[PDB]
Design a protein around this ligand. Structure first.
Ligand SMILES: [O][C][C]1O[C](/O=C2/[C]=[C]C3=NC4=C([C]=C([O])[C]=[C]4)OC3=[C]2)[C]([O])[C]([O])[C]1[O]
Ligand SMILES: [O][C][C]1O[C](/O=C2/[C]=[C]C3=NC4=C([C]=C([O])[C]=[C]4)OC3=[C]2)[C]([O])[C]([O])[C]1[O]
Ligand SMILES: [O][C][C]1O[C](/O=C2/[C]=[C]C3=NC4=C([C]=C([O])[C]=[C]4)OC3=[C]2)[C]([O])[C]([O])[C]1[O]
Ligand SMILES: [O][C][C]1O[C](/O=C2/[C]=[C]C3=NC4=C([C]=C([O])[C]=[C]4)OC3=[C]2)[C]([O])[C]([O])[C]1[O]
Ligand code: CA
Ligand code: CA
Ligand code: CA
Ligand code: CA
Lengths: 121, 121, 121, 121
């Protein structure tokens, strides 16, 4: 299992020690407060009221927690995933990333605390 | 070995000549272009941007190629499977199917060309 | 057999460990999502709607997976090849390459995951 | 080896396929013309006349080519590195980056063409 922080201003994301392998079932729980700019902060689901101006993940809100597995495209994490299995042909280290528009991470703040573990399978 | 076409609008699926037997190793390669409704077409992985609105296979995108072995649950095929072995207790004729919402196949178009063969074991 | 990934941003492609020899029968299965610039992503068949502006392979769409065998010309791979035998004489290491216009790979993203194996002959 | 281009306007840089490991000896050659905003363009050593207004790399001119390896700090690349060995405890993926002030990449233009290879060691 892995536990750590993902900073909202980290554009390249936080690489974890979890290597997702084919067939793996995983659980993720994410908590905390962060912002893509405003002084207000939001949780791991992001800001449901904010428009998508070119987010790295178009299937989650701005300010949401997302991830990449190996060199996959972004996948929404939000508050977490429960006994979750990746699509076919997706594998590799899990990298956690705050959902924002490329080039605009500089004014972000806060972080999410995240647990990831592999489940019985 | 089997080679044939799977029409996107064929809700029942295309039954192939391949009977999958315990211990069998198979390879599938799929190609072509199809749509679940829009003018655009997609390849065998389907449309990654599209929400799951009640697809026959929740483990693949809308417009992806999937299959049933005998009466198994749906199994993602996508662009294909390389030297793949079925889950415990899965056996019978392989049926190829376009991934869409039941009752909505009528506006589908295009097809995938698919090869299936058995590998050494 | 060989399994690995090829970056859309790499003009040099990915050299594999497969040496294609006269008479060899091979199978390739490719999957994944990549872009040659636009926000959308496409599978290994590429973008069937995009014009050819000087692609390294004129026989496949922009954004498709292609290959070279030794010092051959580019050969389309797309989603894969099923028990495929090459054009006469062709031989040498297989290099996998993303199909784009030379000099323009700078805005490319994503990758394809590929399995290659030799079949019986 | 890796071959490609690095867009001047990409704040996140260009993540190559090269993973730098302890002991590796690498060569990089970079060419081309790019700008941090003005209509003029400069080569990979950037603009020797331009003041540092908060560059991501203080050891290179604005408009220069630099890199990170894994999560290292920025390392000047300029026109390239000849049979180069990294500092102790530096390792990981090579990301190439245009040297500009954070939050100001949006008006940049052009790119550098870059080759990276591992040398014998
Ligand atoms: O998207 C992303 C971005 O965001 C920003 O912030 C902000 C804030 C506020 C706002 N509002 C509005 C808009 C638009 C429209 O249309 C209306 C309204 O937007 C916005 C934004 C930040 O700052 C940045 O950085 C980014 O992240
Ligand atoms: O899913 C399945 C279905 O699909 C359809 O198509 C379509 C088109 C378009 C669209 N759009 C949108 C949606 C959702 C949301 O949320 C938004 C937007 O969806 C859709 C869909 C068809 O028609 C049918 O048939 C089926 O397939
Ligand atoms: O080809 C290749 C290339 O591509 C690009 O992208 C793009 C985008 C958009 C567009 N649009 C149009 C065209 C043409 C015509 O004629 C019209 C319209 O194109 C295009 C393109 C990129 O960016 C690059 O890089 C390359 O890849
Ligand atoms: O650095 C960086 C920046 O840059 C800019 O651009 C520019 C242009 C011009 C100029 N001039 C001058 C200066 C300073 C002093 O002191 C004097 C003069 O600066 C400048 C700048 C841009 O726009 C931005 O974006 C950035 O990149
Ligand atoms: Ca922001
Ligand atoms: Ca439909
Ligand atoms: Ca391109
Ligand atoms: Ca600038």
């Amino acid at each position: 299992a892995w536990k750590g922080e993902v900073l909202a201003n980290n554009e390249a994301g936080q690489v974890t020690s979890i290597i997702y392998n084919p067939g793996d079932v995983i659980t993720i729980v994410a908590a905390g407060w962060a912002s893509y700019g405003p002084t207000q902060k939001w949780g791991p689901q992001g800001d449901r009221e904010h428009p998508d101006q070119g987010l790295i993940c178009h299937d989650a809100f701005c300010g949401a927690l997302v991830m990449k597995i190996g060199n996959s495209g972004t996948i929404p994490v939000n508050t977490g995933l429960f006994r979750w299995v990746a699509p076919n042909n997706v594998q590799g280290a899990i990298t956690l990333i705050y959902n924002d528009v490329p080039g605009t991470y500089g004014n972000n703040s806060g972080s999410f605390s995240v647990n990831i573990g592999k489940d019985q399978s």
